[PDB]
Design a protein around this ligand. Structure first.
Ligand code: NI
Ligand code: NI
Length: 257
């Protein structure tokens, strides 16, 4: 009933999900000429040393690398956040062409892809309760450009053949998400939403300024995934991004001058 196809894409989502036209929808364009430095912000604290990855799943929209979130093993704190946010999964949004794929844009620039590390606020006890709160989630977004390979991505790329189609999963233990980060943790932040249905306005977005580089070969393998299930006509999993939504009555704040 929703997807990224010719007849169920983002421009249709409002019919089943009227919050698609809400006050705090994501993604947005980040205008670097209007975002303002906020000295009240603190450095990000990314604490992933104890992360436990479990599984990778093709959910028909993207793939999720899933983590054990039953303890404070991989947490995000600091920045704009109060309290402790646990990593539940990461996934990507990507294009059919190197000139599109990201959800956020920077001065209208689209990157080739965008990584989302999804975390929930432990004060709400579980993910499902967290998404019902305005401060329930924190998503760390990282842009991808095509250039050099990202070594820390390669283990993800090489499992993709095993989860080609919707509903397939594979064991994915002992993956270190630190290998997906850029050097700098400088960021922009603003209040927004999930970027897929149900589009809930429960996210503190934290979007890193510095992109990571991935190779053309790495991106090409993402583009071999399928939206469809096994034994169905092939629908390449590409262009699984929602375009920028109106900023409305929000301000984007920068952690850096
Ligand atoms: Ni559907
Ligand atoms: Ni996402």
């Amino acid at each position: 009933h929703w997807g990224y196809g010719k007849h169920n894409g983002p421009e249709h989502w409002h019919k089943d999900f009227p919050i698609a036209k809400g006050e705090r929808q994501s993604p947005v364009d980040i205008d670097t000429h209007t975002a303002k430095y906020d000295p009240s912000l603190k450095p990000l604290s990314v604490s992933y040393d104890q992360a436990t990855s479990l599984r990778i799943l093709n959910n028909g929209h993207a793939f999720n690398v899933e983590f054990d979130d039953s303890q404070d093993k991989a947490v995000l704190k600091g920045g704009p956040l109060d309290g402790t946010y646990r990593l539940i999964q990461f996934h990507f949004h990507w294009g059919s062409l190197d000139g599109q794929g990201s959800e956020h844009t920077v001065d209208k620039k689209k990157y080739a892809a965008e990584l989302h590390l999804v975390h929930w606020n432990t004060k709400y006890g579980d993910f499902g309760k967290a998404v019902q709160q305005p401060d329930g989630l924190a998503v760390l977004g990282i842009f991808l450009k095509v250039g050099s390979a990202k070594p820390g991505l390669q283990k993800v790329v090489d499992v993709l053949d095993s989860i080609k189609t919707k509903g397939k999963s594979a064991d994915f233990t002992n993956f270190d998400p630190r290998g997906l980060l850029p050097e700098s943790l400088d960021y922009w932040t603003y209040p927004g939403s999930l970027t897929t249905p149900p589009l809930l306005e429960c996210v503190t977005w934290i979007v890193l300024k510095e992109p990571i580089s991935v190779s053309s070969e790495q991106v090409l393998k993402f583009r071999k995934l399928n939206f469809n299930g096994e034994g169905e006509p092939e629908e390449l999993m590409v262009d699984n991004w929602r375009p920028a939504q109106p900023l409305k009555n929000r301000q984007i704040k920068a952690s850096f001058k």
